[PDB]
């Protein structure tokens, strides 16, 4: 063990991370974002012309 | 941790030039978990018999 | 660190403790002195201009 | 699609060291507890007998 203690020579140490995390990914959604929802209550819907 | 080695023969002129001692860091002892379970798989026809 | 302030006061206390060890291993020994003044010690002044 | 994420999937994982530090250095010192200082101005000391 040597006497002067150097950053190399430490063994506990904290290695404070940044605390977060950084996602960057598109989540805009354009088309979802407009054209209101509906509910409806069977699987299957239709609509006249 | 630990302090220096087995200690004696420390006798040093009024100036030696102090020679970077050696002082040495701790020493890291770690561990992992282990995991015990039991299971019990019982009918329902048991759990009513006497 | 986990368990430590600062790497210079804690490794002074391991020191100011190491020195306590070294003095009562040195007082126990069997070591005589060191009469550097060659027959001069029967003397209060100091040794010949030599 | 796992069930569950394990452990050594964990890109974080904290250290969750220790807060404290174990010693096992004697510092008994049973001689030098019974002798008693006593201060001086010269560096050699003498007394007769």
Redesign the interface.
């Not at chain 2, 860091?25 to 299971?39: D, G």
């Not at chain 3, 804690?10 to 003044?37: C, F, H, N, P, W």
């Not at chain 3, 027959?39 to 030599?50: E, G, K």
């Given at each position: 063990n040597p006497t002067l203690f150097v950053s190399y020579d430490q063994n506990g140490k904290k290695l404070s991370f940044a605390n977060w995390i950084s996602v960057l990914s598109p989540q805009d959604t354009p088309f979802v974002s407009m054209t209101g929802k509906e509910s409806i209550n069977q699987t299957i819907f239709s609509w006249q012309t | 941790?630990?302090?220096?080695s087995v200690?004696?023969?420390?006798?040093h002129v009024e100036g030696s030039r102090a020679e970077?001692?050696?002082?040495?860091?701790?020493?890291?002892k770690s561990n992992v978990t282990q995991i015990l379970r039991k299971v019990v798989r019982v009918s329902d026809t048991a759990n009513t018999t006497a | 660190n986990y368990g430590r302030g600062r790497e210079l006061m804690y490794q002074l206390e391991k020191k100011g403790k190491e020195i306590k060890r070294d003095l009562e291993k040195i007082l126990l020994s069997g070591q005589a002195r060191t009469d550097v003044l060659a027959d001069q010690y029967l003397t209060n002044s100091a040794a010949d201009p030599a």
């Amino acid at each position: 063990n040597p006497t002067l203690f150097v950053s190399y020579d430490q063994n506990g140490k904290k290695l404070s991370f940044a605390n977060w995390i950084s996602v960057l990914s598109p989540q805009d959604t354009p088309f979802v974002s407009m054209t209101g929802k509906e509910s409806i209550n069977q699987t299957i819907f239709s609509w006249q012309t | 941790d630990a302090l220096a080695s087995v200690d004696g023969n420390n006798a040093h002129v009024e100036g030696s030039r102090a020679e970077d001692g050696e002082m040495k860091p701790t020493v890291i002892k770690s561990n992992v978990t282990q995991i015990l379970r039991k299971v019990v798989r019982v009918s329902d026809t048991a759990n009513t018999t006497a | 660190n986990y368990g430590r302030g600062r790497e210079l006061m804690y490794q002074l206390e391991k020191k100011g403790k190491e020195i306590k060890r070294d003095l009562e291993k040195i007082l126990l020994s069997g070591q005589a002195r060191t009469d550097v003044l060659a027959d001069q010690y029967l003397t209060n002044s100091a040794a010949d201009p030599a």
